[PDB]
């Protein structure tokens, strides 16, 4: 079901190494809907290459546009299992401190802030 369940540790590590080689300015991001979630739709895909210069505030805007949300749908983005302290941080910095050991950056979204 989940990304980690679909691919082996070995496969996830190698895929991150291929993105390093072919798309060196990109952050490899896994974005998954909360398993509880009722209101928001699922994304068309799981794996995203995010320009390393955009901050978390712009990634939230990007994802809200990709889900085709409207002005008054709530949207909450967890990173590496927890709330973001700040949305102003560049994803390059966020990546260095929050990356998984497989080298992906894992995110989960919901309409409730209480996941
Ligand atoms: C099948 C739904 N597709 C989308 O909503 C989308 C957005 N960007 N690329 N695809
Ligand atoms: Cl690149």
Swiss-Prot record:
Keyword Ligase: no
GO molecular function, one term: ubiquitin protein ligase binding
Outcome (variant: residue 53 to D): Increased interaction with WDFY3/ALFY, no effect on SQSTM1-binding
Pfam families from the UniProt entry: ATG8 (PF02991)
Effect of residue 48 to A: Decreases C18 ceramide binding
Subcellular location field: Cytoplasmic vesicle, Autophagosome membrane; Endomembrane system; Mitochondrion membrane; Cytoplasm, Cytoskeleton
Tissue-by-tissue expression: Most abundant in heart, brain, skeletal muscle and testis. Little expression observed in liver.
Record field: transmembrane: none
Keyword Ribonucleoprotein: no
Effect of residue 23 to Y: Increased interaction with WDFY3/ALFY, no effect on SQSTM1-binding
SUPFAM superfamilies on file: Ubiquitin-like
Function comment: Ubiquitin-like modifier involved in formation of autophagosomal vacuoles (autophagosomes). Plays a role in mitophagy which contributes to regulate mitochondrial quantity and quality by eliminating the mitochondria to a basal level to fulfill cellular energy requirements and preventing excess ROS production.
Identification of the protein by name: Microtubule-associated protein 1 light chain 3 beta
């Amino acid at each position: 079901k989940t990304f980690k369940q679909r691919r082996t540790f070995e496969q996830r590590v190698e895929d991150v190494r291929l993105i390093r080689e072919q798309h060196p300015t990109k952050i490899p991001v896994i974005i998954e809907r909360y398993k509880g979630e009722k209101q928001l739709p699922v994304l068309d895909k799981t794996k995203f290459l995010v320009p390393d210069h955009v901050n978390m505030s712009e990634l939230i805007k990007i994802i809200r546009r990709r889900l085709q949300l409207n002005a008054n749908q709530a949207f909450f983005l967890l990173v590496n299992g927890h709330s973001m302290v700040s949305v102003s941080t560049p994803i390059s910095e966020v990546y260095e401190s929050e990356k998984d050991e497989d080298g992906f950056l894992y995110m989960v979204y919901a309409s409730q802030e209480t996941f």
